[PDB]
Design a protein around this ligand. Structure first.
Ligand SMILES: Nc1ncnc2c1ncn2[C@@H]1O[C@H](COP(=O)(O)OP(=O)(O)OP(O)(O)=S)[C@@H](O)[C@H]1O
Ligand SMILES: [Mg+2]
Lengths: 187, 419
């Protein structure tokens, strides 16, 4: 049931990120227009520069949270597809993996880990061979529409806007500045 | 027409409510004047209410009652306390009294009190018999105080740093020596909100004197506990009377086996204020300070202790360092050795902006064994031995770097022991 809530969380995060980008664009165009204008009010220029900084920080935060929500949605979908696929073909997997999976319960921790890594690189080679075969991969029927709407990868505008990294002190001072700025602008 | 909701709400609500039933134009009086008036006309209709405050006794036997939000400032909001009340309910200074009040009658200009119904958040009848301060016996700080959240923010990192640098326990006596621009503000914040988020059971108070108005007004909206302050605009008499009133109220509160924690700013400013207000004793030492001036702050700071039967008064205070005024080091040297522990801060650390600028090597505590366990204390001396060889600032970057990625100090212990 977490699939639907994750999907709507991702879509509303994307909508809020779009809101942030168009607000930032409006602020940028207003600042450019006032710069091109004859008006020399330095206070307006400084407050618009503060607007630009706050808006770009908010856009970066929105992009980051949208990316993390998208990754969470993809992880949940992958987990569910793996779960029902293994519930379908567990005997089929285990028939092939038997030579190094016998007595897993009685095996010690290091033996369990070594068997896990052996199965790990075995299936890694199997997936490499499958990719080398080169057939195009299609989404599951049960989760087709949600994955198509979300897409394989997020928008490039989300990933290129998160290039800059902010230290926690900068993030917190930006949070206070944005809070006070919104409080003053609302009035 | 209880003064609590008429005082917590902004002046706009007060003037709106005044215009609702028709007072004279309210945009010219003061907050105390406005509340006094509006309560007088609204109480003239014929109903009575409760009333809460803290009582003090002046030179005369008659007493006054003040409010906490008004920064302990005398005014029309003060409530009469007749000496008959002092006899019939053994009243003394610093008790929180809630009860029926009386509208100001003719010939009297402040508010009056009719009956008492809650003395020190308790029934007055059962509070008649009480153990007073002079016979109380102190004790070592045993109950460890937690200031760590584990969330991992910069405030959380500073909290973890101050926790590991020196232990803080209930009913202790501590000092925070730091020159200006050493981060005293967000440090004192850190302590305030950390013990507020960790120990809601104990009441939180912060007293502030001669700070800037912006600092105190951003204090009022940052800490959940009540904060009392008086800036440098008021004379030194206001500062000293606020300090004495609040410390005696805290003593009365802790007399009820209630844990109380005090953030004090600053012992040097307090000593200067008392020196200005106290009469000269004829024996002035270096710095224009006479002997009796520092005697009041001595017992002011010495009131911190841990009570045997219940409750604990913890006081952590800050002192100005090397500000260029010759009395600052006088009060410094006078107050050294009187506290259970001290925390040092430096300037060269904050020049490179390594926050917090605490000095681990100079930091220390007395009787750490009783306050904590041997295992965690040894897990502390190991950090001590690690930090002694290299420099203080280098240890600062080392500690912040190797504590940043770790969520909590407890996990940090096993993360560092393997190295
Ligand atoms: N933990 C911290 N997180 C973020 N900024 C900090 C931290 N500690 C110190 N600072 C910065 O340190 C600078 C100075 O701090 P202050 O609190 O103003 O110094 P101070 O010790 O209180 O002395 P004053 O107030 O200047 S007289 C500010 O710009 C703060 O942002
Ligand atoms: Mg400060």
């Amino acid at each position: 049931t977490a699939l639907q809530q994750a999907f709507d969380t991702c879509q509303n995060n994307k909508a809020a990120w779009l809101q942030r980008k168009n607000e930032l664009a409006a602020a940028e165009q207003e600042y450019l227009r006032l710069l091109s204008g004859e008006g020399r009010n330095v206070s307006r220029l400084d407050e618009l520069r503060n607007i630009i900084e706050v808006r770009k920080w908010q856009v970066n935060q929105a992009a980051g949270r949208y990316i993390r929500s998208h990754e969470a949605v993809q992880h949940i979908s992958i987990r569910d597809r793996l779960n029902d696929f293994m519930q379908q073909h567990g005997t089929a997997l285990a028939a092939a993996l038997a030579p190094e999976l016998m007595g897993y319960s009685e095996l010690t921790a290091i033996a369990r880990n070594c068997a896990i890594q052996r199965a790990t690189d075995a299936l890694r080679e199997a997936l490499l061979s499958w990719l080398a075969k080169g057939e195009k991969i299609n989404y599951s029927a049960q989760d087709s529409d949600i994955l198509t709407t979300i897409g394989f990868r997020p928008d490039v505008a989300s990933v290129d806007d998160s290039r800059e990294k902010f230290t926690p002190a900068q993030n917190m001072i930006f949070s206070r500045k944005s809070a006070q700025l919104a409080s003053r602008q609302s009035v | 027409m209880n003064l609590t909701e008429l005082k917590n709400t902004p002046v706009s609500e007060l003037i709106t409510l005044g215009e609702n039933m028709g007072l004279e134009n309210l945009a010219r009086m003061r907050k105390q004047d406005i509340i006094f008036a509006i309560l007088k006309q609204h109480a003239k209709s014929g109903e009575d209410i409760f009333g809460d405050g803290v009582l003090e006794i002046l030179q005369d036997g008659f007493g006054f009652l003040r409010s906490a939000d008004s920064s302990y400032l005398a005014g029309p909001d003060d409530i009469y306390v007749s000496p008959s009340q002092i006899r019939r309910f053994n009243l003394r200074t610093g008790d929180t009294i809630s009860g029926k009040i009386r509208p100001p009658k003719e010939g009297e200009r402040y508010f009056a009190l009719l009956k008492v119904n809650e003395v020190n958040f308790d029934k007055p009848e059962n509070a008649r018999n009480k153990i007073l301060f002079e016979n109380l016996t102190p004790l070592h700080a045993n109950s460890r105080l937690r200031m760590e959240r584990g969330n991992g923010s910069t405030e959380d990192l500073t909290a973890r740093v101050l926790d590991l640098a020196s232990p803080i326990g209930r009913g202790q006596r501590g000092l925070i020596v730091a020159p200006p621009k050493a981060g005293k503000t967000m440090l004192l914040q850190n302590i305030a909100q950390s013990i507020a988020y960790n120990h809601p059971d104990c009441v939180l108070m912060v007293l502030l004197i001669d700070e800037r108005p912006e600092e105190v007004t951003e204090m009022q909206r940052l800490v959940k506990g009540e904060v009392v302050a008086s800036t440098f605009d008021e004379p030194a008499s206001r500062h000293v009377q606020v300090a004495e009133m609040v410390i005696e109220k805290a003593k009365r509160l802790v007399e009820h086996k209630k844990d109380v924690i005090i953030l004090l700013d600053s012992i040097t400013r307090l000593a200067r204020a008392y020196n200005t207000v106290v009469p000269a004793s004829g024996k002035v030492l270096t710095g224009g300070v006479d002997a009796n001036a520092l005697h009041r702050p001595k017992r002011f700071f010495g009131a911190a202790r841990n009570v045997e039967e219940g409750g604990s008064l913890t006081i952590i205070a800050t002192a100005l360092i090397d500000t260029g005024s010759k009395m600052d080091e006088v009060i410094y040297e006078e107050f050294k050795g009187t506290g259970n522990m001290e925390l040092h801060l430096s300037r060269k650390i904050a020049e490179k902006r390594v926050f917090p600028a605490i000095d681990y090597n100079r930091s220390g505590t007395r009787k750490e064994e009783l306050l904590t366990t041997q295992e965690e204390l040894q897990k502390m001396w190991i950090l001590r031995k690690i930090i002694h060889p290299m420099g203080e600032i280098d240890a600062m970057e080392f500690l912040i770097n190797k504590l940043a990625m770790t969520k909590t100090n407890d996990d940090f212990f096993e993360m560092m022991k393997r190295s």
